[PDB]
Design a protein around this nucleic acid. Structure first.
Lengths: 97, 94, 107, 80, 108, 94, 97, 79
DNA sequence: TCGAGAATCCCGGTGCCGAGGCCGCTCAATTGGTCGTAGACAGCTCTAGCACCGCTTAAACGCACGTACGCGCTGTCCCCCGCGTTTTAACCGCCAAGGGGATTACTCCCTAGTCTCCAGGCACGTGTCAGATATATACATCCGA
DNA sequence: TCGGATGTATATATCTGACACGTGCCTGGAGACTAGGGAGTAATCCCCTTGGCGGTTAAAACGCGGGGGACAGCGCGTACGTGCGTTTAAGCGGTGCTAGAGCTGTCTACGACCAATTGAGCGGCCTCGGCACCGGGATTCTCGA
């Protein structure tokens, strides 16, 4: 029963997903979430496909950058695990809280 | 000396409407003039971009209203839209 | 001619509709400017001025002062959730900072 | 209508992996969902404002591009 | 008349001086636009395009590809310090990120 | 359809000048068009502000040069200024 | 009599968070501004308002940076401020990033 | 001229007390001087660019205000 | 809990300089008519967004184990704080000189504007060759052992 | 320190659809002028910026004792990573419909422009009272018993 140590597959995934450009969120759930959010601003709203694609690209870029900022806060406190406090500190220093 | 215009007169009129006894200093008046100018340029630039996006040559009350909704946060936007609509309705009536 | 009536009086405002119209017409914003745009913009600017001045006057009265100084303007803006959002990348000269000491620093 | 749970835990783990994150706490996923909801709410509010101004029913890619540019998040490759 | 010569031919440019002039004149920037402003702007735009395209072509060559894709443009922009400063608040669609892992996370 | 113009043929000409053997995709050309439009808008807006500050009603190559200096970083600004000056001199002489 | 090593520091925190004065001496700051400006254009003159605006902006920037730095120090379970906290704050903000 | 040393340790300590800092490391002053120098260099470079465009030898407060607004650091109270 | 002792605050006089009010006057906003085109409106058309529908199958979900890490506790010791003395130079009050910011007049050249026209660029149509997609092989790396 | 086994990179077919090229047309940029006003160039005025000096004293620099916080071990419990088996909707490809985005033709009403008129706002000038400053006592926080 071969088993990798905790962290080996994590670094493998880091390299694999930093080497590619694909979208990491499933498209249909994101489209449904976007339509659900937009329902509160206007009813019977229609969306171009490129509009939802642009929204997904922007959201994924924002989340990735926020995770890079969060990792620095985790490392600053002498940790390797990212915690919600690291996200909160990153968003506070950024100016988004 | 050349004539340099500012918003000091109107800021003081509004101040006397709100607090009839409270006064203002020179630096606070400078800050208020800067605030009014900053918000004017923000709203006017947003409205200019809105007109350019839709291929129109005119900046109208619709453009200003949309710019106010885009820029001002939350309840500020709602109250400012109410104020602007009321002013335009009163102006058009008279 | 008929006696002149300023557009601010017609609109019921104390901010200049005519000056704002001139600033819009000579500001390189659009080819044309509508007749209700200066009225709307003047109303919005006057509303924002009134909000800030009300809060700043409250701060001045709290500090037992008759006049508004930049400290009172800063206290008004930074203690309002929406005025702090509007003036987020804005520095007010001679305003200082809000008194705020972290809880871990206390004895 | 509970569509925020369609942003699954594996998706957030992938987005963290592209961000260089090795270990993740179990409470990170709810925080990330809240952050994403806030971001999407702001951007979609701006885009729908742009759509309403144009007297349109369909939200176009240009509305999203302008909405993002308003927040200071210029995006290339979708028109502007 | 005479054989018409484009103003991008008189300036030795591959970017349109006439179209840039028209966009400046009809963009609500100033009341008037000078004759050398379109030439200067077209030259600057062409220089920036040329340098980013040179870096992107180098990136495409490194990956053994004959065509530039958004990943190559992102690699070019993020690997150049000045281009990264110029495009720091810009998102390139399908560009991915720059491979980077912190040293404390590496196995040792 | 209607004619929608873009910097597609000019970016391709510059690419053929720089790397004569490679091509470009449609998404990469979309990104290049967006980049050209974005930088054009940045420089033009900076020059418009510069002309407004100094109370001039004309945007000239001096406004463009100063906008380039203010916007572009370091060596980018120097080389872009050199290229623009060369183009303007060649155009005026020709 | 002798106060314990934290009392006077808290007193000064309360004192300088209550005032609006400028905390750097004006003559050294003016000399620094002129020295820095020497590298861009020779034989330069400065309005008093220009140097005053520069000092206000610089002091506001430094105070905000020190707030972010204090947050970073508290994140790492410290009460002392350190250069790594300044670096983390400047990286998350986007200055040294 | 070492005029960056005119921004003294007590001055930086006062700036830290206004920011809420209770304890300060001994290496904080040199780092703060470096950060201040970089910030001032950026702002002064932009202000001087504005000054030379106007064909002036004097740097005005409006040049500083424009330079700060370019940096995303709008300042109220000087024009 | 309880007293020295120190720091901040809170009342009373001083006086002073900046905010607030007043007065010319000048230019910018108002009033009253044309003009022409920007946009409002009606109609057609024909993309493209939406709503099922069935099949793969890739990905999500749930669970079990254990191991690495987060977190609390303890001890060192040295570095930062508080305080006293000496030294330095910032600051404040004047004084003098002049460089350069700011304003005014004149005129010329440069930009807007118009008509003609024709060639550059855009939409379309088409084919072929980079590249995505299997597929087998060859290594690079990891984890006991 | 060597042997397995797992994951990823490389080299060879092989379709395919998207990119690069060619063609027709049309509309926007170039050529050739004309007209007028923006700005470039002198000149002048006087403001405010720079340089200098002296005295006070506020702040900075230095040093010294000590306490408390940064930091390095050390241990322990748990919660997150890895991997396997089950479930589920995502993705794909076709199908049909029609909502609305987009374009075109009319026409009208609204904003630009212009000329004359006057009053609102700006610069300059006082004046007194709100606040900065000075002094003394009450209040409170701190800290060693």
């Amino acid at each position: 029963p071969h088993r990798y140590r905790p962290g080996t597959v994590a670094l493998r995934e880091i390299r694999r997903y930093q080497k590619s450009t694909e979208l990491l969120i499933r498209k249909l759930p994101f489209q449904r979430l976007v339509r659900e959010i937009a329902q509160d601003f206007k009813t019977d709203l229609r969306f171009q496909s490129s509009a939802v694609m642009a929204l997904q690209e922007a959201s994924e870029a924002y989340l990735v950058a926020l995770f890079e900022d969060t990792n620095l806060c985790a490392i600053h406190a002498k940790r390797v695990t990212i915690m919600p406090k690291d996200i909160q500190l990153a968003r506070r220093i950024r100016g988004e809280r | 000396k050349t004539r340099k215009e500012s918003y000091a007169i109107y800021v003081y009129k509004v101040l006397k409407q709100v607090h009839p006894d409270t006064g203002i200093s020179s630096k606070a008046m400078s800050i208020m003039n800067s605030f009014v100018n900053d918000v004017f340029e923000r709203i006017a630039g947003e409205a200019s971009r809105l007109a350019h996006y839709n291929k129109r040559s005119t900046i109208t009350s619709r453009e200003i209203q949309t710019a106010v909704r885009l820029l001002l946060p939350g309840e500020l936007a709602k109250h400012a839209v109410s104020e602007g609509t009321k002013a335009v309705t009163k102006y058009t009536s008279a | 001619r008929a006696k002149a009536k300023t557009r601010s009086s017609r609109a019921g405002l104390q901010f200049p509709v005519g000056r704002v119209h001139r600033l819009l017409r000579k500001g390189n914003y659009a080819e044309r400017v509508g007749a209700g745009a200066p009225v709307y913009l003047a109303a919005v600017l006057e509303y924002l001025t009134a909000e800030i001045l009300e809060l700043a006057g409250n701060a001045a009265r709290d500090n037992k002062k008759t006049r508004i100084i930049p400290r009172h303007l800063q206290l008004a803006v930074r203690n309002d959730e929406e005025l702090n959002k509007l003036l987020g990348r804005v520095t007010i000269a001679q305003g200082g900072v809000l008194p705020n000491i972290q809880s871990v620093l206390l004895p | 209508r509970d569509n925020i749970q369609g942003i699954t835990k594996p998706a957030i783990r992938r987005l963290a992996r592209r961000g260089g994150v090795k270990r993740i706490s179990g409470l990170i996923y709810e925080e990330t969902r809240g952050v994403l909801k806030v971001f999407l709410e702001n951007v979609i509010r701006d885009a729908v404002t742009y759509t309403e101004h144009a007297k349109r029913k369909t939200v176009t890619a240009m509305d999203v591009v302008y909405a993002l540019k308003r927040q200071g998040r210029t995006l290339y490759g979708f028109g502007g």
